[PDB]
Amino acid sequence: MISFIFAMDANRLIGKDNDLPWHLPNDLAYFKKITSGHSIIMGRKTFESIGRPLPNRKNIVVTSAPDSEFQGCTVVSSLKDVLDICSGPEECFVIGGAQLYTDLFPYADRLYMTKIHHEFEGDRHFPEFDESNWKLVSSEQGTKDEKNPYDYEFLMYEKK
C-alpha cells in the first residue's frame, strides 16, 4: 500500500532551494506520528534536505547513487523496486519530493495532506490532481499558536 504524506501551501508549493518554505513544528510532529512504524520512501534530494536518516523508520532512498553513499538508508534505483517492496497490505509512506509525488501519484491509496492557507515563494510543487476523485476521510484544524502561526489543517483523503 502506498500513502503520501506532504505539506503544501495554497499554490501547491512544497519546496524552495532544496528546503521547506516555512517552519511548522506541529506539522513535523504530525509527520513523525503518522510515519512511525513504516518504511518511508524519498528521492535523493529530499533525503539530503532532511540531512540524516529519520529514526524508527526504514529510510528508502530512490537514487542512481551507489549504496555506499547512503549507508544509513536502503537505496533503490527505480520506482519499480519501490512498488515491489511496498506491494500488499503493509503501508509505505512516500515522503517526496516533487518528482516522487508526481510519478507515484497513480499508485497512491491515501493522501495525508497538510494544507497551509498561505502563499510562499518557491520552486517545487505537489502535482495537480482532481479532488473529485477522492473522499475527504478526515480533517482537523492545526493548532494556531506562537510556534505554528499559520492557518493549516491536517487532511486525509482515500482514493475512490
Ligand SMILES: NC(=O)c1ccc[n+]([C@@H]2O[C@H](COP(=O)([O-])OP(=O)(O)OC[C@H]3O[C@@H](n4cnc5c(N)ncnc54)[C@H](OP(=O)(O)O)[C@@H]3O)[C@@H](O)[C@H]2O)c1
Ligand atoms: N513540503 C513537503 O511536504 C515536502 C516533502 C518532501 C520534500 N519537500 C521538498 O521538495 C524538494 C525536493 O523535491 P525534488 O522533486 O527536487 O527532489 P526529490 O524528488 O526528492 O529527489 C530527486 C532525485 O531523486 C532521485 N529520483 C527521483 N525519482 C527517481 C526515479 N524515478 N528514479 C531514479 N531516481 C529518482 C534522483 O536522484 P539521483 O540524482 O541521485 O539519481 C533525483 O535527482 C525540497 O525542496 C524539499 O524540501 C517538501
Ligand SMILES: Nc1nc(=O)c2nc(CNc3ccc(C(=O)N[C@@H](CCC(=O)O)C(=O)O)cc3)cnc2[nH]1
Ligand atoms: N506533513 C509533512 N510536512 C513536511 O514538512 C514534510 N516534509 C517532508 C520532507 N522534509 C522533512 C524535514 C524534516 C523532517 C523531520 O525532521 N522529521 C522528524 C520530526 C520530529 C519532530 O519534529 O517531532 C521526524 O522524526 O519525523 C521530516 C521531513 C516530507 N513530508 C512532509 N510531510
